[PDB]
Structure 1
Amino acid sequence: MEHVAFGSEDIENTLAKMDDGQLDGLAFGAIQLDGDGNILQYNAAEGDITGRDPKQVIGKNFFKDVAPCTDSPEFYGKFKEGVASGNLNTMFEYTFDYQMTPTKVKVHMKKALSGDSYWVFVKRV
């Protein structure tokens, strides 16, 4: 397994070196979106939480297509504020409940070392 801690301070650096295969080796959910909320990477752990087959949701829009409950000032709004600012690093709990058993999760959004990419780390609480 990949030894990366959820919430680590230099995580963006650590995952920068990871391909899709290795990303599935993480101990938590990992999603990489571009500036518009489209899905670039999506590991199996995140699939374990929501029920999405990793390969099937990539290319989809997270907020419009995949996770509509996250479309609110409390999630999507924080994301759109960060992209525009060119800086994002916020952690907060949330309840995943669209087409699934309400699952309470801890969410960590942070700008990736890459140009226009943003990470969404999730773990059960």
Structure 2
Amino acid sequence: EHVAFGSEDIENTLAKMDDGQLDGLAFGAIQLDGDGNILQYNAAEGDITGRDPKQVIGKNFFKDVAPCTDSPEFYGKFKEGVASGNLNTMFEYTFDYQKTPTKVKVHMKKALSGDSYWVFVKRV
């Protein structure tokens, strides 16, 4: 799937993708509901993070899978965007719960579909 991390229209392009198409992206992609529950989780994200894309669906990202992101800098930005109904933020972050500290770039962007939000990840 020919789509770049950070592209302006990413939410329009990713509205059409099934599981298999999301798995063809060059970067990690997670779709969360407004509470942080995982709706979609692609193969590229599992390759970066070691998590099993099949097992994480239905878990809460902030409570269960990713406690290192339960902080004002990540979760706080997420919830502020859910509350406002708009979200488009990029930042760097370190993942160090199950892994050697690993720095990534994160892009969170409200989806087109209802009650859903994207978290995109790539290595830096």
TM-score band by shorter chain is over 0.9
- Residues 20-54 of structure 1 deviation map (CA, whole Å, 9 limit, x = unaligned): 11100000000000010000000011101111110
Task: State how far apart, in whole Å, the 1-side matches of 2:72 and 2:87 are.
Answer: 15
In the TM superposition, residue 115 of structure 1 has moved relative to its aligned partner by: 1.3
In the TM superposition, residue 101 of structure 1 has moved relative to its aligned partner by: 1.2
SS of the equivalent of 1:74 reads helix
Give ranges in structure 1 of 5+ residues lacking alignment: none
TM-score (norm 2): 0.99
Give the equivalent residue in structure 1 for 2:2: 3
- Residues 37-77 of structure 1 deviation map (CA, whole Å, 9 limit, x = unaligned): 00000001110111111000000000000000000000000
Task: State how far apart, in whole Å, the 2-side matches of 1:57 and 1:107 are.
Answer: 19
Q: Which runs of 4+ in 1 moved over 3 A?
A: none
Give the equivalent residue in structure 2 for 1:123: 122
SS of the equivalent of 2:68 reads helix
Over aligned residues, Cα RMSD in angstroms? 0.5
% identical aligned pairs:
99
Give ranges in structure 2 of 5+ residues lacking alignment: none
- Residues 61-104 of structure 1 deviation map (CA, whole Å, 9 limit, x = unaligned): 00000000000000000000000000000000000111111110
TM-score (norm 1): 0.98
- How many residues get paired? 124
